[PDB]
Write a protein that binds this ligand. Sequence first.
Ligand SMILES: Nc1ncnc2c1ncn2[C@@H]1O[C@H](CO)[C@@H](NC(=O)[C@@H](N)CO)[C@H]1O
Ligand SMILES: Nc1ncnc2c1ncn2[C@@H]1O[C@H](CO)[C@@H](NC(=O)[C@@H](N)CO)[C@H]1O
Lengths: 136, 136
Amino acid sequence: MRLLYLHADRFEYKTVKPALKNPPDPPGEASFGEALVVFTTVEDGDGPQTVMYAASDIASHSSRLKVTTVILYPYAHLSSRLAKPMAAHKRLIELEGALRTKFPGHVHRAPFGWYKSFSIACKGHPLAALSRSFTE
Amino acid sequence: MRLLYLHADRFEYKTVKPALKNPPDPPGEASFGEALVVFTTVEDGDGPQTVMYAASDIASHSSRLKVTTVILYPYAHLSSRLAKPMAAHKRLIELEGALRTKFPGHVHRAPFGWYKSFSIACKGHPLAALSRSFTE
Ligand SMILES: Nc1ncnc2c1ncn2[C@@H]1O[C@H](CO)[C@@H](NC(=O)[C@@H](N)CO)[C@H]1O
Ligand SMILES: Nc1ncnc2c1ncn2[C@@H]1O[C@H](CO)[C@@H](NC(=O)[C@@H](N)CO)[C@H]1O
Protein backbone atom coordinates (compact mmCIF):
# COMPACT_ATOMS: atom_id res chain seq x y z
CA MET A 1 0.00 0.00 0.00
CA ARG A 2 1.35 3.47 -0.88
CA LEU A 3 -0.10 6.57 0.84
CA LEU A 4 0.37 10.29 0.33
CA TYR A 5 -0.57 12.39 3.44
CA LEU A 6 -1.62 15.91 2.53
CA HIS A 7 -2.52 18.27 5.40
CA ALA A 8 -5.24 20.30 3.73
CA ASP A 9 -6.85 23.65 4.58
CA ARG A 10 -9.70 22.56 2.34
CA PHE A 11 -10.57 19.69 -0.02
CA GLU A 12 -13.37 18.74 -2.34
CA TYR A 13 -14.03 16.21 -5.06
CA LYS A 14 -16.70 15.04 -7.48
CA THR A 15 -16.91 11.85 -9.46
CA VAL A 16 -17.09 12.35 -13.22
CA LYS A 17 -17.01 9.42 -15.64
CA PRO A 18 -16.91 5.83 -14.41
CA ALA A 19 -13.33 4.52 -14.58
CA LEU A 20 -14.33 0.84 -14.38
CA LYS A 21 -17.16 -0.91 -16.24
CA ASN A 22 -19.03 -1.26 -12.96
CA PRO A 23 -17.84 1.14 -10.24
CA PRO A 24 -18.66 -0.62 -6.90
CA ASP A 25 -19.54 2.63 -5.11
CA PRO A 26 -22.17 5.13 -6.32
CA PRO A 27 -21.14 8.57 -7.72
CA GLY A 28 -20.94 11.72 -5.61
CA GLU A 29 -19.29 14.77 -4.29
CA ALA A 30 -18.16 16.29 -1.00
CA SER A 31 -16.10 19.14 0.42
CA PHE A 32 -14.21 19.64 3.69
CA GLY A 33 -12.31 22.20 5.78
CA GLU A 34 -9.06 21.32 7.48
CA ALA A 35 -8.44 17.60 6.93
CA LEU A 36 -5.66 15.04 6.42
CA VAL A 37 -6.21 13.91 2.79
CA VAL A 38 -4.83 10.37 2.38
CA PHE A 39 -4.29 9.48 -1.27
CA THR A 40 -4.37 5.69 -1.11
CA THR A 41 -2.98 3.23 -3.71
CA VAL A 42 -3.69 -0.43 -2.90
CA GLU A 43 -0.81 -2.58 -3.99
CA ASP A 44 -0.45 -6.19 -5.04
CA GLY A 45 -0.29 -8.33 -1.94
CA ASP A 46 -1.84 -5.88 0.52
CA GLY A 47 -3.83 -7.75 3.22
CA PRO A 48 -5.39 -7.15 6.62
CA GLN A 49 -2.00 -6.78 8.29
CA THR A 50 -1.08 -4.04 5.79
CA VAL A 51 -4.46 -2.39 6.44
CA MET A 52 -3.91 -2.58 10.20
CA TYR A 53 -0.45 -0.93 10.05
CA ALA A 54 -1.66 1.82 7.67
CA ALA A 55 -4.68 2.64 9.88
CA SER A 56 -2.46 2.92 12.99
CA ASP A 57 0.02 5.16 11.15
CA ILE A 58 -2.70 7.45 9.71
CA ALA A 59 -4.23 7.78 13.19
CA SER A 60 -0.86 8.51 14.76
CA HIS A 61 -0.05 11.22 12.11
CA SER A 62 -3.51 12.78 12.45
CA SER A 63 -2.86 12.97 16.16
CA ARG A 64 0.60 14.55 15.56
CA LEU A 65 -1.15 17.12 13.26
CA LYS A 66 -4.12 17.71 15.66
CA VAL A 67 -6.61 17.10 12.77
CA THR A 68 -10.17 15.92 13.38
CA THR A 69 -10.92 14.78 9.84
CA VAL A 70 -9.34 12.11 7.62
CA ILE A 71 -10.30 11.63 3.96
CA LEU A 72 -9.39 8.24 2.46
CA TYR A 73 -9.05 9.07 -1.24
CA PRO A 74 -8.67 6.00 -3.54
CA TYR A 75 -5.93 6.79 -6.03
CA ALA A 76 -4.62 4.61 -8.79
CA HIS A 77 -1.47 6.64 -9.32
CA LEU A 78 1.01 6.38 -6.46
CA SER A 79 2.76 3.15 -7.53
CA SER A 80 3.51 0.68 -10.31
CA ARG A 81 2.42 -2.39 -8.31
CA LEU A 82 -1.33 -1.94 -8.23
CA ALA A 83 -3.72 -4.45 -6.76
CA LYS A 84 -6.51 -5.53 -9.10
CA PRO A 85 -9.63 -3.36 -8.59
CA MET A 86 -11.74 -5.91 -6.68
CA ALA A 87 -8.94 -6.55 -4.14
CA ALA A 88 -8.31 -2.79 -4.07
CA HIS A 89 -11.94 -1.97 -3.20
CA LYS A 90 -11.94 -4.66 -0.53
CA ARG A 91 -8.79 -3.24 1.05
CA LEU A 92 -10.11 0.37 1.11
CA ILE A 93 -13.28 -0.70 2.86
CA GLU A 94 -11.15 -2.56 5.33
CA LEU A 95 -8.88 0.45 5.77
CA GLU A 96 -11.87 2.68 6.47
CA GLY A 97 -13.24 0.25 9.14
CA ALA A 98 -9.74 -0.17 10.68
CA LEU A 99 -9.09 3.57 10.93
CA ARG A 100 -12.38 4.04 12.78
CA THR A 101 -11.06 1.69 15.52
CA LYS A 102 -7.97 3.87 15.89
CA PHE A 103 -9.02 7.49 15.21
CA PRO A 104 -11.96 9.28 17.00
CA GLY A 105 -12.55 11.94 14.34
CA HIS A 106 -14.59 12.08 11.15
CA VAL A 107 -13.50 9.34 8.66
CA HIS A 108 -14.59 9.95 5.02
CA ARG A 109 -13.89 7.37 2.31
CA ALA A 110 -14.29 8.78 -1.19
CA PRO A 111 -15.92 6.49 -3.79
CA PHE A 112 -13.85 3.93 -5.61
CA GLY A 113 -13.74 3.25 -9.40
CA TRP A 114 -14.55 6.73 -10.85
CA TYR A 115 -12.48 9.44 -12.48
CA LYS A 116 -12.76 12.39 -10.17
CA SER A 117 -12.01 16.08 -10.21
CA PHE A 118 -10.78 17.55 -6.98
CA SER A 119 -9.48 20.75 -5.49
CA ILE A 120 -7.17 21.00 -2.53
CA ALA A 121 -5.40 23.76 -0.64
CA CYS A 122 -2.49 22.01 0.96
CA LYS A 123 -0.52 23.52 3.90
CA GLY A 124 3.23 24.32 3.57
CA HIS A 125 4.53 23.33 6.99
CA PRO A 126 7.30 20.75 7.22
CA LEU A 127 4.83 17.86 7.90
CA ALA A 128 2.08 18.88 5.47
CA ALA A 129 3.16 16.35 2.78
CA LEU A 130 4.63 12.93 3.54
CA SER A 131 4.38 9.55 1.90
CA ARG A 132 4.18 6.12 3.53
CA SER A 133 4.52 2.50 2.36
CA PHE A 134 2.93 -0.47 4.09
CA THR A 135 3.29 -4.18 3.34
CA GLU A 136 3.14 -7.53 5.17
CA MET B 1 12.41 9.52 -11.99
CA ARG B 2 8.74 9.32 -10.91
CA LEU B 3 6.21 11.85 -12.28
CA LEU B 4 2.58 12.59 -11.50
CA TYR B 5 0.74 14.42 -14.36
CA LEU B 6 -2.16 16.49 -13.11
CA HIS B 7 -4.26 18.34 -15.72
CA ALA B 8 -5.16 21.43 -13.74
CA ASP B 9 -7.82 24.12 -14.21
CA ARG B 10 -5.71 26.26 -11.91
CA PHE B 11 -2.59 25.94 -9.74
CA GLU B 12 -0.62 28.08 -7.35
CA TYR B 13 2.14 27.64 -4.81
CA LYS B 14 4.27 29.57 -2.34
CA THR B 15 7.45 28.56 -0.62
CA VAL B 16 7.26 28.57 3.17
CA LYS B 17 10.14 27.35 5.33
CA PRO B 18 13.41 26.17 3.80
CA ALA B 19 13.45 22.35 3.66
CA LEU B 20 17.23 22.10 3.22
CA LYS B 21 19.94 24.03 5.09
CA ASN B 22 20.70 25.95 1.91
CA PRO B 23 17.89 25.84 -0.67
CA PRO B 24 19.62 26.31 -4.10
CA ASP B 25 16.75 28.35 -5.56
CA PRO B 26 15.36 31.55 -4.00
CA PRO B 27 11.85 31.60 -2.38
CA GLY B 28 8.70 32.62 -4.23
CA GLU B 29 5.20 32.18 -5.39
CA ALA B 30 3.20 31.88 -8.61
CA SER B 31 -0.25 31.00 -9.90
CA PHE B 32 -1.53 29.65 -13.22
CA GLY B 33 -4.70 28.88 -15.21
CA GLU B 34 -5.06 25.68 -17.16
CA ALA B 35 -1.74 23.82 -16.95
CA LEU B 36 -0.23 20.32 -16.82
CA VAL B 37 1.23 20.17 -13.26
CA VAL B 38 4.13 17.67 -13.23
CA PHE B 39 5.00 16.57 -9.70
CA THR B 40 8.58 15.42 -10.16
CA THR B 41 10.58 13.09 -7.86
CA VAL B 42 14.21 12.61 -8.93
CA GLU B 43 15.34 9.11 -8.18
CA ASP B 44 18.68 7.50 -7.46
CA GLY B 45 20.46 6.89 -10.72
CA ASP B 46 18.53 9.37 -12.88
CA GLY B 47 20.79 10.84 -15.61
CA PRO B 48 20.55 12.78 -18.85
CA GLN B 49 18.97 9.86 -20.68
CA THR B 50 16.23 9.69 -18.02
CA VAL B 51 15.77 13.46 -18.34
CA MET B 52 15.55 13.19 -22.12
CA TYR B 53 12.85 10.46 -22.04
CA ALA B 54 10.80 12.32 -19.37
CA ALA B 55 10.91 15.60 -21.33
CA SER B 56 9.72 13.86 -24.53
CA ASP B 57 6.90 12.12 -22.66
CA ILE B 58 5.74 15.31 -20.88
CA ALA B 59 5.73 17.14 -24.23
CA SER B 60 3.83 14.34 -25.93
CA HIS B 61 1.17 14.25 -23.12
CA SER B 62 0.84 18.05 -23.12
CA SER B 63 0.23 17.80 -26.84
CA ARG B 64 -2.38 15.02 -26.31
CA LEU B 65 -4.08 17.32 -23.71
CA LYS B 66 -3.79 20.50 -25.88
CA VAL B 67 -2.21 22.41 -22.91
CA THR B 68 0.05 25.42 -23.41
CA THR B 69 1.58 25.46 -19.94
CA VAL B 70 3.69 22.92 -18.04
CA ILE B 71 4.67 23.36 -14.38
CA LEU B 72 7.65 21.27 -13.22
CA TYR B 73 6.97 20.92 -9.49
CA PRO B 74 9.86 19.37 -7.47
CA TYR B 75 8.35 16.84 -5.09
CA ALA B 76 10.12 14.66 -2.59
CA HIS B 77 7.19 12.32 -2.08
CA LEU B 78 6.44 10.14 -5.10
CA SER B 79 8.96 7.35 -4.40
CA SER B 80 11.19 5.60 -1.88
CA ARG B 81 14.33 5.78 -4.06
CA LEU B 82 15.15 9.46 -3.88
CA ALA B 83 18.23 11.00 -5.42
CA LYS B 84 20.31 13.09 -3.01
CA PRO B 85 19.29 16.78 -3.16
CA MET B 86 22.27 18.08 -5.14
CA ALA B 87 21.80 15.44 -7.89
CA ALA B 88 18.04 16.09 -7.69
CA HIS B 89 18.44 19.85 -8.28
CA LYS B 90 20.81 19.18 -11.15
CA ARG B 91 18.33 16.81 -12.79
CA LEU B 92 15.37 19.24 -12.48
CA ILE B 93 17.34 22.02 -14.12
CA GLU B 94 18.23 19.60 -16.85
CA LEU B 95 14.61 18.50 -17.18
CA GLU B 96 13.48 22.10 -17.52
CA GLY B 97 16.06 22.81 -20.29
CA ALA B 98 15.20 19.51 -22.07
CA LEU B 99 11.45 20.14 -22.04
CA ARG B 100 12.00 23.55 -23.65
CA THR B 101 13.61 21.76 -26.65
CA LYS B 102 10.51 19.59 -27.02
CA PHE B 103 7.49 21.72 -25.99
CA PRO B 104 6.68 25.22 -27.45
CA GLY B 105 4.54 26.43 -24.55
CA HIS B 106 5.27 28.13 -21.24
CA VAL B 107 7.63 26.00 -19.05
CA HIS B 108 7.63 26.93 -15.33
CA ARG B 109 9.98 25.20 -12.88
CA ALA B 110 8.99 25.76 -9.26
CA PRO B 111 11.84 26.33 -6.76
CA PHE B 112 13.66 23.39 -5.28
CA GLY B 113 14.49 22.75 -1.57
CA TRP B 114 11.57 24.53 0.20
CA TYR B 115 8.42 23.34 1.93
CA LYS B 116 5.60 24.77 -0.12
CA SER B 117 1.88 25.27 0.19
CA PHE B 118 -0.09 24.86 -2.99
CA SER B 119 -3.63 24.81 -4.28
CA ILE B 120 -4.81 22.97 -7.34
CA ALA B 121 -8.10 22.37 -9.10
CA CYS B 122 -7.52 19.18 -11.00
CA LYS B 123 -9.77 18.07 -13.91
CA GLY B 124 -11.76 14.77 -13.73
CA HIS B 125 -11.46 13.51 -17.30
CA PRO B 126 -9.97 10.08 -17.90
CA LEU B 127 -6.47 11.50 -18.67
CA ALA B 128 -6.37 14.23 -16.01
CA ALA B 129 -4.20 12.16 -13.60
CA LEU B 130 -1.51 9.71 -14.72
CA SER B 131 1.85 8.70 -13.35
CA ARG B 132 5.05 7.89 -15.24
CA SER B 133 8.41 6.28 -14.39
CA PHE B 134 11.64 6.95 -16.27
CA THR B 135 15.05 5.33 -15.85
CA GLU B 136 18.14 4.52 -17.94
N1 LIG C 1 -5.07 -0.26 -6.76
C1 LIG C 1 -5.89 0.78 -6.57
N2 LIG C 1 -5.75 1.58 -5.47
C2 LIG C 1 -6.55 2.62 -5.29
N3 LIG C 1 -7.54 2.92 -6.14
C3 LIG C 1 -7.73 2.15 -7.24
C4 LIG C 1 -6.90 1.07 -7.49
N4 LIG C 1 -7.33 0.52 -8.61
C5 LIG C 1 -8.38 1.20 -9.08
N5 LIG C 1 -8.63 2.21 -8.24
C6 LIG C 1 -9.78 3.15 -8.35
O1 LIG C 1 -10.32 2.94 -9.69
C7 LIG C 1 -10.33 4.24 -10.35
C8 LIG C 1 -9.71 4.00 -11.73
O2 LIG C 1 -8.45 3.29 -11.59
C9 LIG C 1 -9.35 5.09 -9.55
N6 LIG C 1 -9.64 6.51 -9.68
C10 LIG C 1 -8.70 7.40 -9.53
O3 LIG C 1 -7.45 7.01 -9.18
C11 LIG C 1 -9.10 8.90 -9.67
N7 LIG C 1 -8.62 9.81 -8.58
C12 LIG C 1 -8.65 9.49 -11.01
O4 LIG C 1 -9.40 10.71 -11.25
C13 LIG C 1 -9.62 4.64 -8.13
O5 LIG C 1 -10.86 5.20 -7.67
N1 LIG D 1 14.74 13.65 -4.99
C1 LIG D 1 14.02 14.78 -5.05
N2 LIG D 1 13.16 15.01 -6.08
C2 LIG D 1 12.44 16.12 -6.13
N3 LIG D 1 12.53 17.07 -5.20
C3 LIG D 1 13.38 16.91 -4.16
C4 LIG D 1 14.14 15.76 -4.05
N4 LIG D 1 14.87 15.88 -2.95
C5 LIG D 1 14.61 17.06 -2.38
N5 LIG D 1 13.69 17.69 -3.11
C6 LIG D 1 13.19 19.08 -2.86
O1 LIG D 1 13.66 19.41 -1.51
C7 LIG D 1 12.47 19.79 -0.74
C8 LIG D 1 12.57 19.01 0.57
O2 LIG D 1 12.81 17.60 0.30
C9 LIG D 1 11.30 19.21 -1.53
N6 LIG D 1 10.06 19.94 -1.26
C10 LIG D 1 8.91 19.36 -1.40
O3 LIG D 1 8.83 18.08 -1.85
C11 LIG D 1 7.64 20.22 -1.11
N7 LIG D 1 6.55 20.16 -2.14
C12 LIG D 1 7.00 19.88 0.25
O4 LIG D 1 6.12 20.96 0.62
C13 LIG D 1 11.73 19.44 -2.96
O5 LIG D 1 11.59 20.82 -3.30
